[PDB]
Amino acid sequence: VTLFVALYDYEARTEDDLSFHKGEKFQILNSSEGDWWEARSLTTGETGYIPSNYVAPVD
Amino acid sequence: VTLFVALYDYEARTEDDLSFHKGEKFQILNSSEGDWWEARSLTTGETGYIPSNYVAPVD
Amino acid sequence: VTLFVALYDYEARTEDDLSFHKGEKFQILNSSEGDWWEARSLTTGETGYIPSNYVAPVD
Amino acid sequence: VTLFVALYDYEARTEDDLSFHKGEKFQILNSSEGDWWEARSLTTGETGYIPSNYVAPVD
């Protein structure tokens, strides 16, 4: 399972976080040890940490 | 300090309460003034009252 | 609610604390946040933090 | 003992209270059952309630 969709919008707080919009999809290979996962957006191509509670596996 | 985590989404009514989404984690600032607790979101760093029956201790 | 009464005069340092004179009586609003209590003067109706070791319960 | 001097200034909150300045003297015949005493100022001639902790018997 590596495809996840955003449930809510999110505005990055720092340079390493990724901002994104609800409905946006990501590739997330491995989850982290924390609440923050490193993702790549399939829309913008950008990469960065996202809060793991904001996405769900794409059905 | 124990973290607490949101069980459900909650949308604030005024500027005093804090909107949050399920799974968001908080550090509690003041819990002894009543059932609404002053808390900081570990997600955004925002601060405000949250209804304590909407959160549980992490673990 | 128990009234408390000032044992000594006290002059506030900022706008948050409350200046008061010996014998002034207060009704306490919040006493569980620490040793500084949020109180209303029964004399002027002003509100602010007062150092709890400067007051005693009436009687 | 009926002569008392004011220890601090006081600005009346209502129409029945007497405002006064530190060093001002009053005649106070009988003390009340409460913290408020009915006084007459020997300076202005006015009469009204004053907080009893603000005056002391004139020595």
Curated annotation (Swiss-Prot), chains A, B, C, D:
<comment type="subunit">
    <text>Interacts (via its SH3 domain) with PIK3R1 and PRMT8. Interacts with FYB1, PAG1, and SH2D1A. Interacts with CD79A (tyrosine-phosphorylated form); the interaction increases FYN activity. Interacts (via SH2 domain) with CSF1R (tyrosine phosphorylated). Interacts with TOM1L1 (phosphorylated form). Interacts with KDR (tyrosine phosphorylated). Interacts (via SH3 domain) with KLHL2 (via N-terminus). Interacts with SH2D1A and SLAMF1. Interacts with ITCH; the interaction phosphorylates ITCH and negatively regulates its activity. Interacts with FASLG. Interacts with RUNX3. Interacts with KIT.</text>
</comment>
<comment type="function">
    <text>Non-receptor tyrosine-protein kinase that plays a role in many biological processes including regulation of cell growth and survival, cell adhesion, integrin-mediated signaling, cytoskeletal remodeling, cell motility, immune response and axon guidance. Inactive FYN is phosphorylated on its C-terminal tail within the catalytic domain. Following activation by PKA, the protein subsequently associates with PTK2/FAK1, allowing PTK2/FAK1 phosphorylation, activation and targeting to focal adhesions.</text>
</comment>
<feature type="domain" description="SH3">
    <location>
        <begin position="1"/>
        <end position="59"/>
    </location>
</feature>
<comment type="subunit">
    <text>(Microbial infection) Interacts (via its SH3 domain) with hepatitis E virus/HEV protein ORF3.</text>
</comment>
<protein>
    <recommendedName>
        <fullName>Tyrosine-protein kinase Fyn</fullName>
    </recommendedName>
</protein>
<comment type="similarity">
    <text>Belongs to the protein kinase superfamily. Tyr protein kinase family. SRC subfamily.</text>
</comment>
